[PDB]
Amino acid sequence: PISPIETVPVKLKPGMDGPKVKQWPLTEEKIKALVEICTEMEKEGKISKIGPENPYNTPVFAIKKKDSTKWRKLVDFRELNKRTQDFWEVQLGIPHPAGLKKNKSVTVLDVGDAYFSVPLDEDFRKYTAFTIPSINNETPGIRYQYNVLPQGWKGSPAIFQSSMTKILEPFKKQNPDIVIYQYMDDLYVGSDLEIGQHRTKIEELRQHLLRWGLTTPDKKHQKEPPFLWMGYELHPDKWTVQPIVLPEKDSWTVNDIQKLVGKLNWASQIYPGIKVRQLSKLLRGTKALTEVIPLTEEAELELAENREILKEPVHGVYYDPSKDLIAEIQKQGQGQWTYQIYQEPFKNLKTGKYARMRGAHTNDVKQLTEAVQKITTESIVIWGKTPKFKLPIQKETWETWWTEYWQATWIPEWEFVNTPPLVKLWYQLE
Amino acid sequence: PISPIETVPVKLKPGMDGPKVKQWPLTEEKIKALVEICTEMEKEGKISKIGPENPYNTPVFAIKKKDSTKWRKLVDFRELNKRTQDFWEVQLGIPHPAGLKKNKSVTVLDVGDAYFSVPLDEDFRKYTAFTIPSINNETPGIRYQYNVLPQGWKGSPAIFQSSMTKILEPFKKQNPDIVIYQYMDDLYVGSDLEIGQHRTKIEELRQHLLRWGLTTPDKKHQKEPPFLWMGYELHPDKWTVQPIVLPEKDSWTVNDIQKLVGKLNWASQIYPGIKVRQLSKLLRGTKALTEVIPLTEEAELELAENREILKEPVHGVYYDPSKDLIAEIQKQGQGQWTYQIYQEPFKNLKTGKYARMRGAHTNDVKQLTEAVQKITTESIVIWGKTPKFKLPIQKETWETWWTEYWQATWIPEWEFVNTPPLVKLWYQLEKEPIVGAETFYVDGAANRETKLGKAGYVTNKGRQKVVPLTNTTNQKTELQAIYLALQDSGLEVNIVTDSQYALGIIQAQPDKSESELVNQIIEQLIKKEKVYLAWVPAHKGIGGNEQVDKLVSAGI
Ligand SMILES: COc1ccc2c(c1)N(C(=O)OC(C)C)[C@@H](CSC)C(=S)N2
Numbered sequence: 010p011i012s013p014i015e016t017v018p019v020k021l022k023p024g025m026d027g028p029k030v031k032q033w034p035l036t037e038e039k040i041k042a043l044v045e046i047c048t049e050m051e052k053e054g055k056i057s058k059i060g061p062e063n064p065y066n067t068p069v070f071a072i073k074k075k076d077s078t079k080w081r082k083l084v085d086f087r088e089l090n091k092r093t094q095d096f097w098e099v100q101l102g103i104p105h106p107a108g109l110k111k112n113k114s115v116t117v118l119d120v121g122d123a124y125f126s127v128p129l130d131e132d133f134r135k136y137t138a139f140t141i142p143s144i145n146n147e148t149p150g151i152r153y154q155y156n157v158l159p160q161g162w163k164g165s166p167a168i169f170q171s172s173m174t175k176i177l178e179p180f181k182k183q184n185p186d187i188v189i190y191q192y193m194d195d196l197y198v199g200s201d202l203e204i205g206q207h208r209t210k211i212e213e214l215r216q217h218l219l220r221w222g223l224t225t226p227d228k229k230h231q232k233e234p235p236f237l238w239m240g241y242e243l244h245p246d247k248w249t250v251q252p253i254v255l256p257e258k259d260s261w262t263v264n265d266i267q268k269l270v271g272k273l274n275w276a277s278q279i280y281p282g283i284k285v286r287q288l289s290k291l292l293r294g295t296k297a298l299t300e301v302i303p304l305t306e307e308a309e310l311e312l313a314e315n316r317e318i319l320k321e322p323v324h325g326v327y328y329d330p331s332k333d334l335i336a337e338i339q340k341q342g343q344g345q346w347t348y349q350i351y352q353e354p355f356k357n358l359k360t361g362k363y364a365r366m367r368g369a370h371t372n373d374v375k376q377l378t379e380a381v382q383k384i385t386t387e388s389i390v391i392w393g394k395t396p397k398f399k400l401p402i403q404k405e406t407w408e409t410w411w412t413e414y415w416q417a418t419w420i421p422e423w424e425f426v427n428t429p430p431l432v433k434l435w436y437q438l439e
Numbered sequence: 440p441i442s443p444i445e446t447v448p449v450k451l452k453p454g455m456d457g458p459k460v461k462q463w464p465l466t467e468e469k470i471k472a473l474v475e476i477c478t479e480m481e482k483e484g485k486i487s488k489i490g491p492e493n494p495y496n497t498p499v500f501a502i503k504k505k506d507s508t509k510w511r512k513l514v515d516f517r518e519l520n521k522r523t524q525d526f527w528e529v530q531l532g533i534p535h536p537a538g539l540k541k542n543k544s545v546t547v548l549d550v551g552d553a554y555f556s557v558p559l560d561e562d563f564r565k566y567t568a569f570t571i572p573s574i575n576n577e578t579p580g581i582r583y584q585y586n587v588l589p590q591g592w593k594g595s596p597a598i599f600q601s602s603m604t605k606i607l608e609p610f611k612k613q614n615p616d617i618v619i620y621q622y623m624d625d626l627y628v629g630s631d632l633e634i635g636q637h638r639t640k641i642e643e644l645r646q647h648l649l650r651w652g653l654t655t656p657d658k659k660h661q662k663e664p665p666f667l668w669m670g671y672e673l674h675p676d677k678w679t680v681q682p683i684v685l686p687e688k689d690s691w692t693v694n695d696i697q698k699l700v701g702k703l704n705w706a707s708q709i710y711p712g713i714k715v716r717q718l719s720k721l722l723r724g725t726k727a728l729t730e731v732i733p734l735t736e737e738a739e740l741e742l743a744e745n746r747e748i749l750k751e752p753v754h755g756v757y758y759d760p761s762k763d764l765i766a767e768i769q770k771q772g773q774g775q776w777t778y779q780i781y782q783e784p785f786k787n788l789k790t791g792k793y794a795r796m797r798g799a800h801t802n803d804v805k806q807l808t809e810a811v812q813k814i815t816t817e818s819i820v821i822w823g824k825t826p827k828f829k830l831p832i833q834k835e836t837w838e839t840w841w842t843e844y845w846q847a848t849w850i851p852e853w854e855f856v857n858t859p860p861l862v863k864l865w866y867q868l869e870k871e872p873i874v875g876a877e878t879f880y881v882d883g884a885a886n887r888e889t890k891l892g893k894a895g896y897v898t899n900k901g902r903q904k905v906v907p908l909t910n911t912t913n914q915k916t917e918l919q920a921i922y923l924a925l926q927d928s929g930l931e932v933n934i935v936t937d938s939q940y941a942l943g944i945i946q947a948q949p950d951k952s953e954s955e956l957v958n959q960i961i962e963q964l965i966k967k968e969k970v971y972l973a974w975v976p977a978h979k980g981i982g983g984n985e986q987v988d989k990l991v992s993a994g995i
Pocket residue numbers: 534536539540541542545618619620627628629630664666668673674675676757
């Protein structure tokens with residue numbers, strides 16, 4: 010059904026033409042799946058095949074977001090966002106409720122399908138062009154352009170903002186002590202009431218939503234060992250830590266002292282004014298390694314006083330919204346990895362430790378991808394912005410396997426680290 | 440004959456206007472030869488004389504090829520191409536013969552001048568305008584304008600393909616099984632029907648096309664069964680590139696080596712083992728195509744080694760999905776590795792090579808995995824599938840590696856295989872400090888300007904030593920110091936460094952580097968029983984560091 014509803018004119022920043030992005034080659038199953046999807050969406054009037062007159066493009070992918078049964082077509086709108094929305098980050102930008110982070114418990118749920126009923130500006134549709142890749146270039150690429158609002162796109166929820174707000178009010182009214190943020194096809198809901206009360210409160214919103222429109226928060230189900238049931242349930246009541254942790258026992262031999270000093274010297278670049286000198290003095294004598302040398306007098310002053318500056322970090326806690334967040338993860342012990350988000354080096358806004366149970370699927374890539382995904386949500390909730398990721402993985406590698414374990418609707422910007430840092434410790438930061 | 444098919448809408452790059460080039464006349468026999476074609480091209484409707492209105496010019500070249508019998512012209516729309524909007528990428532890559540299916544009969548149709556049958560958008564025609572003055576320029580109104588897709592123009596290919604895609608659709612469905620492919624002026628049709636049932640269908644396609652407006656004057660299959668598609672030699676069950684000949688000179692240039700490296704690179708597809716390692720290593724100098732680069736004995740021993748291979752024909756088999764895919768890789772040394780992908784053993788599907796260039800000294804394993812990747816990648820690009828890996832690596836050496844390395848990876852389904860060039864980690868730097876072993880506090884440095892360095896050490900039991908070095912770098916010194924430390928030590932040793940850089944390379948565990956020093960160090964590492972490496976800061980560091988550098992400094 011072609012809706013006679015009026016659309017909002019989408020014009021980007023001049024001096025910036027549409028995305029002409031290369032479509033990554035996909036697996037056979039993945040292609041057929043996209044074809045399936047699109048063919049039905051084409052009937053539905055949502056998308057439309059175009060001609061050569063449309064030179065623009067966007068990457069498409071195939072995900073298994075639900076619980077890994079059906080395929081979700083994921084669109085890499087990263088460029089278009091840049092290309093339009095960074096000027097629609099102001100024009101009709103959704104503001105961030107700075108306490109959502111201070112909140113006790115939050116939940117995330119797909120609200121992507123919502124935008125599908127609503128139509129997309131005629132003179133702009135061209136920019137949504139994507140291509141389904143033919144295997145081995147056998148046949149010409151399959152080209153469609155969106156006619157309605159795009160899922161991945163950041164401009165979509167911006168337009169639907171008006172509609173969404175309205176469709177929220179009844180719940181918002183009867184339920185005041187609940188925050189609701191809309192970053193993309195996801196709605197973040199926060200509460201200070203406990204689990205039981207909260208889940209029933211979520212089901213309420215789900216019901217409410219579903220009542221007030223075919224806006225369908227996709228089905229609740231279980232998975233991992235201690236069985237879950239509905240939505241991605243975060244808990245920012247504990248979103249802070251000090252992963253530093255110095256050796257509370259191993260400070261007896263020369264090497265232990267030697268190694269110690271170096272980490273401390275790196276810490277100097279972050280926490281200013283760390284006294285290492287008095288401690289590094291009882292080393293100078295070129296003494297043998299493994300020699301159990303007991304710690305001196307003035308040397309102990311350099312530890313205990315700077316071991317408490319490690320448990321109380323304050324300086325430029327500031328966050329520049331004019332600048333972007335940069336999160337870099339580094340591979341640590343088998344199951345664990347460690348992330349660090351900063352906007353200007355050493356000035357670390359958030360520092361955490363990820364760790365998936367070593368046994369379930371001891372896969373290297375899964376782990377990272379999983380990390381990034383989480384690391385990202387952590388950002389939105391706290392800042393409403395996706396970080397550029399400095400990835401310790403081969404470009405080509407990632408570009409192959411990421412889409413495999415990608416259960417998210419969004420895709421953050423990324424980069425790849427081709428350099429080994431001394432930064433990796435027993436418990437490391439940046 | 441003009442095709443009725445719907446023409447796509449074309450505009451000029453925003454705020455731009457079309458070409459206006461009132462060309463310099465030529466009263467030559469060429470000017471008559473022009474109208475000979477035109478006032479016979481308009482008869483076929485390809486072009487049309489337009490009125491003295493606004494239509495602005497585009498230069499006509501009345502030329503003809505070396506005695507081509509049929510004097511044919513051509514308008515060069517160089518400036519028009521500049522003005523016209525952007526279209527979709529036509530040459531989005533070509534299909535690779537490596538992943539095609541076995542076809543009983545294949546046909547190829549000539550779609551040249553079919554561009555000339557497909558029509559051009561009406562609100563655009565005016566831009567392809569051109570005039571041509573004859574005798575005494577007193578008859579300028581010989582102004583024509585294109586109605587179809589102009590040869591050489593920008594839209595021409597992207598539109599044509601689209602129109603053809605459009606056109607073939609009803610036909611592709613009245614008989615789904617038969618597949619068609621198209622590119623430029625070629626039409627590679629193919630199916631598994633008996634020759635007669637097959638050859639009839641072709642004439643059917645031909646009439647269909649001819650029913651729109653396109654033409655195939657070639658009575659049947661005119662292109663000989665062996666095909667030269669993009670150089671490749673195509674036959675019903677095998678593929679290669681028959682013309683694969685590279686001449687032997689004696690005093691060649693960069694210009695000529697580039698073509699060599701390229702023709703050799705081309706051959707890497709089916710011909711197994713081709714190495715362009717030393718062959719390209721030399722081109723690295725600042726480009727000037729006309730500069731002669733004298734060959735090395737290595738570069739000589741590589742070409743002839745390749746010539747050996749390239750002298751004899753070897754073909755490639757086709758893809759059959761029903762069968763699983765498998766790829767095998769093996770090391771050739773000096774960074775060179777080679778792969779082959781097959782289904783039926785020794786039924787070579789395709790081959791290729793990887794080499795870690797420029798970025799020197801790296802682990803053998805990282806290479807193997809970097810290799811797998813290219814393959815993994817290239818497989819999806821072709822078969823949309825990832826292959827089974829047959830590779831010379833002990834499962835335990837891999838386990839330990841990813842469990843050791845910093846960067847993340849994932850090698851899919853793989854299995855072991857034996858071949859003398861086996862990949863393994865020869866040594867491992869000790870995790871914890873060795874107890875009984877001597878502690879070599881080490882330091883190295885150089886006067887960057889003078890290039891004269893001094894490398895050396897000091898030990899827990901005052902075993903000092905400092906050795907001079909000239910025409911070396913500050914880093915070369917840093918490594919020299921370790922090698923030294925290794926030499927003068929026993930079987931197990933503990934070595935400490937001031938340079939973070941120094942540390943890296945050793946931890947990286949490379950092998951067979953062209954760097955003479957690194958090899959020496961490697962060998963020492965392999966010879967050793969245990970080696971604990973430690974790192975402490977360069978300047979403000981003590982632990983002996985507050986003496987080892989005061990020991991290796993002299994000059995400025
Ligand atoms: C001797 O020529 C061939 C032998 C085997 C194949 C082809 C040609 N193929 C093709 O696209 O033509 C060119 C671009 C290679 C198609 C059948 S033609 C549709 C396939 S699936 N295998």
